[PDB]
Every structure is written in C-alpha cells, then in structure tokens.
Amino acid sequence: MQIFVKTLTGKTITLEVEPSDTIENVKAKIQDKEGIPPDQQRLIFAGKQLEDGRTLSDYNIQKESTLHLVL
Amino acid sequence: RWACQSCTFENEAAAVLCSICERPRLA
C-alpha cells in the first residue's frame, strides 16, 4: 500500500512499501528515493517512536495513516 | 502529558522539550 510521511516543514512524501517492510526498510526506501539518511530518521505516531528492528505490521499501522519524520 | 505541535509526540507532563525533536512544550 501507499503511505505518507509528514515532516516538520509541512511536506508530505509518498512511499511504496510492503506490510512486511521494517521501519528500517521504510527509512531505506526514504534514502533511496529521497536521499534522507536512515540514521537521522525518527518516526513518531500517537506519541510512540518506531524502533528500527520492528516491521510495519508490528505497530498496527492502519488505513489513512500519516507518519511523522523527526531529524 | 502534552502532544508536540510539530510531530504530535505525546510527552510526559514533566518534559520541557519534546523527547524526539527537542522543541519546547509550548512551541
């Protein structure tokens, strides 16, 4: 499915991911298509930080979700 | 608790800065 990542500057980026993709994988997709290093990426939703080792299905990411990117 | 107005992180009440973006509680 296609998801959106929300930045501090009001920019929203579109990503092609797999439900089996890790948070590390999403950061790798951001690096490959947007050039943002995965080491600086910190994903936040509902006051919860996503950990590198877990996948998208681990965090119960539902439909119409918007992710937050903190550097 | 307070939700950060830039990244929506829900912080502890005693937190002065956001734990992830370091922006102040009232920013």
């Binding site: - | 002065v16 922006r23 102040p24 509680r25 009232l26 920013a27």
Partner: protein
Amino acid sequence: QAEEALVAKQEVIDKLCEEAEQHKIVMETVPVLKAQADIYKADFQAERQAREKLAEKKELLQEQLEQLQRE
C-alpha cells in the same frame, strides 16, 4: 512561566537556521562565479589573439594590393 524564554530561544534559533540556508545558497554559487570569471578571461584572450591574427592576415595582404597596383 518556564517557556517565558525557552520559546524565545527557539525563535532566535529558527531565524538563524533560515539565515544559514540563505548563506549556504550564496556560498554554493561562489565556485560557479569563479569558473565564469576564468571563462570570460579565456574568451577575451582568445578574441584578442584572433583579432591580432586577423590584423596580420589583412595588413600583410595589403602588400598584395600594392602588387596589383604596379599594373
């Protein structure tokens, strides 16, 4: 009254980050200006050289107009 000066510091920091981005723009143009200056110098030197070769190839050929002036 904790943020009484903390938000003020964040405001000064944010305006200095915008200043930093503007500075990074100007310094990014610097080597391009240098390359442009060196190019214009080369094209100028080449145009002076090409003019002197022309002034020769004509003022020397002026002797030919004196050759066909004997008839």
